[PDB]
PDB file of C-alpha atoms in Angstrom:
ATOM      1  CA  UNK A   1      42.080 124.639-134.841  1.00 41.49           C
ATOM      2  CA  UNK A   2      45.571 125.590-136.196  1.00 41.57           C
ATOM      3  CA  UNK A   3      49.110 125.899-134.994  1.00 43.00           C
ATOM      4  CA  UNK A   4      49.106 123.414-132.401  1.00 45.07           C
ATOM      5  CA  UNK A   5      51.812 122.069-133.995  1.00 47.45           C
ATOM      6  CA  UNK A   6      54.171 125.406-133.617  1.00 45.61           C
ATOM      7  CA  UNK A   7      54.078 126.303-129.488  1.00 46.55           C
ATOM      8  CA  UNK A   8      55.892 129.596-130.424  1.00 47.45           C
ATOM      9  CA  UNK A   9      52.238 131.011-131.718  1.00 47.46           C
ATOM     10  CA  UNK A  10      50.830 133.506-129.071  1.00 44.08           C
ATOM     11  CA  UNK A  11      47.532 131.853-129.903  1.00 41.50           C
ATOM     12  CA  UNK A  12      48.354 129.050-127.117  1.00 46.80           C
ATOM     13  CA  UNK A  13      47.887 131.299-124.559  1.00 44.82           C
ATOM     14  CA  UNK A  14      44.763 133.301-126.047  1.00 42.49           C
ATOM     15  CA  UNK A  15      43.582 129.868-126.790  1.00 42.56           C
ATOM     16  CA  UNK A  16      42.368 129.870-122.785  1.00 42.31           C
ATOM     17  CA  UNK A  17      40.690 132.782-122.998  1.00 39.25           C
ATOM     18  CA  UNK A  18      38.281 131.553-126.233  1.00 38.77           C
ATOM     19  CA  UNK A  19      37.477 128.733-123.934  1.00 37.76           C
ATOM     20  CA  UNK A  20      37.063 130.491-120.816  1.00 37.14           C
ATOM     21  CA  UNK A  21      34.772 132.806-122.538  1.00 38.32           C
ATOM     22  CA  UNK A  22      32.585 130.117-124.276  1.00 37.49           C
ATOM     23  CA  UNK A  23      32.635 128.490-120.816  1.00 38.38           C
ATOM     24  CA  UNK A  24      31.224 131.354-119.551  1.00 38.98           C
ATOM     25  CA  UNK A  25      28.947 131.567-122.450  1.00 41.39           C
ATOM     26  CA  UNK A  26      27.219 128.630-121.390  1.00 44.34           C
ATOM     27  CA  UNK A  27      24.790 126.555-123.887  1.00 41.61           C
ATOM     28  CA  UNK A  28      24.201 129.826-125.730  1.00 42.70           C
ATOM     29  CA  UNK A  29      26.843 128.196-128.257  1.00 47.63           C
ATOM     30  CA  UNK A  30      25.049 125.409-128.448  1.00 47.56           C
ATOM     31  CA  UNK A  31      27.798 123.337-127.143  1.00 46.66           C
ATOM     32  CA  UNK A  32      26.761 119.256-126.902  1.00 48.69           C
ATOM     33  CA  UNK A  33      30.136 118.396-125.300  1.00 49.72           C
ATOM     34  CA  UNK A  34      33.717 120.162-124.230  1.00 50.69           C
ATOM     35  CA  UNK A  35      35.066 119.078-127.100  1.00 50.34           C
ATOM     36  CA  UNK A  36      32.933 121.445-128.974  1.00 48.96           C
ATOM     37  CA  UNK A  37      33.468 124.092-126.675  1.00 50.39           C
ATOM     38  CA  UNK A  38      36.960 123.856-127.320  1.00 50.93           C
ATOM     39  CA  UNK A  39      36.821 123.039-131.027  1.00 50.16           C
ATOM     40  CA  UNK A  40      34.860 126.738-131.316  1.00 52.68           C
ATOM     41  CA  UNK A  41      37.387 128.224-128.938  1.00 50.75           C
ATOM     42  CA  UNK A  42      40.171 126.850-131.380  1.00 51.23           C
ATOM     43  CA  UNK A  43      38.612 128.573-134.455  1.00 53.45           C
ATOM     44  CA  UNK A  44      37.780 131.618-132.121  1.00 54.06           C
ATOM     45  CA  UNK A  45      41.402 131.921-131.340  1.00 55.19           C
ATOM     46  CA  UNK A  46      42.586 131.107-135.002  1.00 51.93           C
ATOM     47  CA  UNK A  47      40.367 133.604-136.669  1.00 55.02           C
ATOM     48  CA  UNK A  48      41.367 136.640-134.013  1.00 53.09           C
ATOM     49  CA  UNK A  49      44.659 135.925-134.644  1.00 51.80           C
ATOM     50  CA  UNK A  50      44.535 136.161-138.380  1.00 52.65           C
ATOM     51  CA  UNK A  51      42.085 138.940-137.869  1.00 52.53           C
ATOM     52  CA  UNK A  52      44.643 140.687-135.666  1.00 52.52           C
ATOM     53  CA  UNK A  53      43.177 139.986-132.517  1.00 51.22           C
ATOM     54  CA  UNK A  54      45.290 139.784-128.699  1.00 51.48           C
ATOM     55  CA  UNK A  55      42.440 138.407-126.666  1.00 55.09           C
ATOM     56  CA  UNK A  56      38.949 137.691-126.831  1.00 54.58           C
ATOM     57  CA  UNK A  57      37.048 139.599-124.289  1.00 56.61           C
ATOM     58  CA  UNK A  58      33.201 138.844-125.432  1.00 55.62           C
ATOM     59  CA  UNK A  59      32.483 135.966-127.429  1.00 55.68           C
ATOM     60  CA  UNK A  60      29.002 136.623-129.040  1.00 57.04           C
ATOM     61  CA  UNK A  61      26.902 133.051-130.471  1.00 55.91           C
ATOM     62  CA  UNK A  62      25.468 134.030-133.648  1.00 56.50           C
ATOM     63  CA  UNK A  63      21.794 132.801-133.709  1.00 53.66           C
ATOM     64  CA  UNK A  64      22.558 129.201-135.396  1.00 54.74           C
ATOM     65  CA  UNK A  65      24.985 128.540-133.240  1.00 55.87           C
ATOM     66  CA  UNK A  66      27.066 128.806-136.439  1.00 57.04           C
ATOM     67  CA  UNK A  67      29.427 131.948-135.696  1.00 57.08           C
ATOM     68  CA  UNK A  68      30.928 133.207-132.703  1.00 54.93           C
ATOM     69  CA  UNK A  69      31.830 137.275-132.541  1.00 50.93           C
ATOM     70  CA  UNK A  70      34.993 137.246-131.114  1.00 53.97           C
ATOM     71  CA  UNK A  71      35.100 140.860-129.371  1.00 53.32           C
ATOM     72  CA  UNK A  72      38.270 142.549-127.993  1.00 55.51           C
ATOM     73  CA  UNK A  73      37.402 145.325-125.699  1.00 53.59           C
ATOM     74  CA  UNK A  74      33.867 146.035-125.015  1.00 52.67           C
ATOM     75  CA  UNK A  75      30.587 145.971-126.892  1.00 55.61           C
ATOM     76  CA  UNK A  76      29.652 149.635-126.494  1.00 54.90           C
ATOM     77  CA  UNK A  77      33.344 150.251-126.702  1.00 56.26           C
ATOM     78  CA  UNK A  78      33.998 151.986-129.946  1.00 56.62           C
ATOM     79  CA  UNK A  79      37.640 150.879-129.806  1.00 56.57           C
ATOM     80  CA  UNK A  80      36.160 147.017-129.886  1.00 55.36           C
ATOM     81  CA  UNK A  81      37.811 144.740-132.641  1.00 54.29           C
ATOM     82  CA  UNK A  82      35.159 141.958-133.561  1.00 54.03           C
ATOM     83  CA  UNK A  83      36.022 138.804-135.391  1.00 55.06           C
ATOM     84  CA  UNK A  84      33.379 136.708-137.140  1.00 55.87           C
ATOM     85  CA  UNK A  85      34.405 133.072-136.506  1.00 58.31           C
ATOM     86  CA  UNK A  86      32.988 130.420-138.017  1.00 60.91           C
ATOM     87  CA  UNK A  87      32.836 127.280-136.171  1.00 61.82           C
ATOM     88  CA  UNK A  88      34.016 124.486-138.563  1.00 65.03           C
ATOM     89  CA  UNK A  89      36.264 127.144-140.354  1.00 66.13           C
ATOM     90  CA  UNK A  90      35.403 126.119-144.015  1.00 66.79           C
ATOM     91  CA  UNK A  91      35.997 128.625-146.632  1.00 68.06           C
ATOM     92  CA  UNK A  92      32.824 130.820-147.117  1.00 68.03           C
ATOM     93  CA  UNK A  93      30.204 129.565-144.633  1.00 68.08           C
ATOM     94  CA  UNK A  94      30.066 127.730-141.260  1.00 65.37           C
ATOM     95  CA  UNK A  95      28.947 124.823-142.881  1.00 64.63           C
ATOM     96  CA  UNK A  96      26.701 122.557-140.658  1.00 63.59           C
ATOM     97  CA  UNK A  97      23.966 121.252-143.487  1.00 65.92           C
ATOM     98  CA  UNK A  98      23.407 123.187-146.592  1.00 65.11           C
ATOM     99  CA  UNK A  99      20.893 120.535-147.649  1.00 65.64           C
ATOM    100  CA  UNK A 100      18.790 122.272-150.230  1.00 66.44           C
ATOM    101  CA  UNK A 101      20.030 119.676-153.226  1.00 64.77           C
ATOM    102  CA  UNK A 102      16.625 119.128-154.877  1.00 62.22           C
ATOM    103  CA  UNK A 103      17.357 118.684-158.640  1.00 63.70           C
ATOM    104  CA  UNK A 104      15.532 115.501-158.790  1.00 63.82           C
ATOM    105  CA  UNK A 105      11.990 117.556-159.846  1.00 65.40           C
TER     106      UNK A 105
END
């Protein structure tokens, strides 16, 4: 999460809709506590607005868990704007365990 710092960001107030929505998205995030909820909502929130999002309508779980679609409008809408958001931000994936290093053999 971002810009919690600067209250003059319009993100504060979208903020409670990314957190509504995963609230209404249930476990389908894969949420283990509100602070996760609300640690996706705050990258959900930060990625729309740098994607050019105003409000998160649908939030979408990508399979893992790993990426939430951020959706503005509707899904069948063809006016929807959809943001790919990856839930511990990073800089390429949504890095939960990339454990493959087997260099050993």
């Amino acid at each position: 999460g971002s810009h919690m710092s600067d209250p003059r960001h319009p993100d504060n107030a979208m903020y409670n809709g990314a957190v509504s929505k995963l609230e209404a998205l249930g476990e389908r995030g894969g949420f283990a506590n509100r602070k996760e909820l609300e640690q996706a909502a705050g990258q959900i929130v930060f990625e729309s607005k740098v994607s050019g999002l105003q409000r998160i309508d649908h939030v979408v779980p990508n399979k893992s868990g790993d990426g939430f679609f951020a959706v503005q409008g509707e899904l069948t809408d063809p006016a929807m704007q959809r943001v790919f958001v990856d839930r511990n931000q990073a800089q390429n994936q949504p890095l939960e365990n990339s454990s493959r290093q087997a260099a050993e053999e």
